[PDB]
Amino acid sequence: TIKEMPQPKTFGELKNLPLLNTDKPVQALMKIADELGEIFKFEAPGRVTRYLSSQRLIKEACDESRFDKNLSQALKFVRDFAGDGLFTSWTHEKNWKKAHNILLPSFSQQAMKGYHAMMVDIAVQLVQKWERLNADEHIEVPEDMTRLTLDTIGLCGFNYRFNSFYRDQPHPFITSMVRALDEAMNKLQRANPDDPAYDENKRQFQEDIKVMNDLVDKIIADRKASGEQSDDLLTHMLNGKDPETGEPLDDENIRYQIITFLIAGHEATSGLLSFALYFLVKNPHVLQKAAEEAARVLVDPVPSYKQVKQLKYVGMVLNEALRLWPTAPAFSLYAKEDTVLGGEYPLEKGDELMVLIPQLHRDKTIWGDDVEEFRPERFENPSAIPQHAFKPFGNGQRACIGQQFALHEATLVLGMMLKHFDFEDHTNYELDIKETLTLKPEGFVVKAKSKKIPL
Numbered sequence: 001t002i003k004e005m006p007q008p009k010t011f012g013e014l015k016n017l018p019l020l021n022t023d024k025p026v027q028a029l030m031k032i033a034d035e036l037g038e039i040f041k042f043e044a045p046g047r048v049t050r051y052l053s054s055q056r057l058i059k060e061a062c063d064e065s066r067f068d069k070n071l072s073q074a075l076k077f078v079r080d081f082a083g084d085g086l087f088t089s090w091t092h093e094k095n096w097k098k099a100h101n102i103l104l105p106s107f108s109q110q111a112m113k114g115y116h117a118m119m120v121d122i123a124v125q126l127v128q129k130w131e132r133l134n135a136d137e138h139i140e141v142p143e144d145m146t147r148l149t150l151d152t153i154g155l156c157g158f159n160y161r162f163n164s165f166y167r168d169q170p171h172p173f174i175t176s177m178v179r180a181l182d183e184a185m186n187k188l189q190r191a192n193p194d195d196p197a198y199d200e201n202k203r204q205f206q207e208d209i210k211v212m213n214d215l216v217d218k219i220i221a222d223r224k225a226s227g228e229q230s231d232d233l234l235t236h237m238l239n240g241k242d243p244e245t246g247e248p249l250d251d252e253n254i255r256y257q258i259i260t261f262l263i264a265g266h267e268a269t270s271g272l273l274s275f276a277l278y279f280l281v282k283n284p285h286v287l288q289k290a291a292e293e294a295a296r297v298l299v300d301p302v303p304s305y306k307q308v309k310q311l312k313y314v315g316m317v318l319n320e321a322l323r324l325w326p327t328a329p330a331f332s333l334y335a336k337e338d339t340v341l342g343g344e345y346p347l348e349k350g351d352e353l354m355v356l357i358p359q360l361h362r363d364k365t366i367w368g369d370d371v372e373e374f375r376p377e378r379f380e381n382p383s384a385i386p387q388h389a390f391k392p393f394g395n396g397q398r399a400c401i402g403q404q405f406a407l408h409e410a411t412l413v414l415g416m417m418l419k420h421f422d423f424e425d426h427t428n429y430e431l432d433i434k435e436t437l438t439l440k441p442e443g444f445v446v447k448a449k450s451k452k453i454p455l
């Protein structure tokens with residue numbers, strides 16, 4: 001029963017483009033998704049995209065023999081500074097498989113034991129910052145969670161300390177980075193390269209890239225000159241060789257990997273932590289369950305790797321937050337060959353499909369009718385969840401390599417926050433989701449009363 005594909009209103013040669021001409025594109029798309037259903041054709045002047053929203057179709061899109069990772073327009077733009085790092089390479093580019101094969105064992109759950117001490121370091125700095133606040137001062141959740149993630153990836157990545165908790169103005173690198181990312185997203189909604197985009201922006205963009213390249217390159221050069229063997233990712237990349245080709249990574253790719261770990265990892269992981277706290281503070285009974293587990297398990301001044309794995313309920317909290325608002329809301333796919341989706345919608349070779357994750361997670365057919373409710377218990381038995389119903393980390397060989405890293409950190413940090421402080425939503429915050437490459441709660445502020453437990 002092949003059905004015709006819907007489409008929202010168009011604007012001449014500008015097509016549906018104006019439809020997403022807003023500061024909250026993904027959220028608008030979810031709205032359109034509600035109206036048009038599990039699949040719609042979004043057309044732009046010289047680009048076509050089909051957005052999927054149902055587990056029915058998406059489980060078919062996740063068939064790797066039929067569809068493969070497509071570099072969306074945004075990724076192409078991000079490639080200007082992330083080059084051929086894992087995130088912005090095609091599956092068929094030689095450096096994708098090389099870096100993938102080498103980095104894989106370094107991102108396993110087992111490998112987290114080696115990064116744990118470095119994760120604890122930045123975690124304790126966050127707790128102490130909060131411990132030292134004068135009672136009357138509040139906390140800027142997204143802002144602190146961001147400082148937490150940048151520093152953790154910097155330390156675990158290339159053993160470099162950005163020291164974000166010692167300054168107002170971030171390290172110039174981070175500034176150039178957020179700015180480059182910002183610009184990258186701006187080109188996406190550019191009317192044309194001279195509206196607004198002018199030589200001034202392009203100049204700035206090229207300067208930011210220099211700042212990032214200079215720092216990373218130097219660090220890479222120094223490491224191989226000194227010959228230092230730390231437990232960071234840079235060490236693994238300098239001493240690794242692809243089992244297949246027998247080749248090591250080039251210094252430039254290595255640099256791109258490091259930049260990739262930062263741009264791809266920080267915003268999403270900080271967003272995750274913000275939403276989880278948001279939901280916890282809005283659902284007292286859940287917070288009470290989590291705080292008790294945390295106090296019950298984290299019996300030492302500093303969390304051990306083993307202990308973090310015993311925080312079962314906190315894990316459920318993170319997953320449920322990931323269900324409701326996946327911080328990386330979408331990923332693109334293209335058809336390797338002509339085919340039909342759900343035996344209804346015909347697809348041609350190279351057609352792009354954009355998976356709308358937030359909509360996938362709201363599929364009443366899989367999640368029941370209480371999809372908008374925050375209930376961690378629904379992940380009590382993950383094995384009861386259908387395949388391809390929960391995809392916050394992408395699909396297949398192209399899924400987030402930093403998944404275990406993200407979850408281990410988020411679980412460590414949340415556990416420590418719930419153990420040392422009681423949180424107060426003193427302003428009865430109303431959720432405003434800011435969108436960049438990721439999703440994050442804009443302006444979320446809270447107040448934390450310490451339980452005076454030592455670190």
Ligand code: HEM
Pocket residue numbers: 069086087100260261262264265266268269272326327328330331332392393394395397398399400401402403405406407
């Ligand atoms: C909780 C936070 C995170 C979320 C929600 C998330 C989500 C995702 C998603 C959806 C993808 C696939 C994108 C696509 O198919 O186009 C992805 C890819 C990737 N992520 Fe994450 N991510 C998170 C944290 C991290 C962290 C901390 C790192 C860095 C260490 C990271 C590194 C990567 C890389 C390098 C890839 C590409 C892997 C490959 O294609 O070989 N992510 N992530």
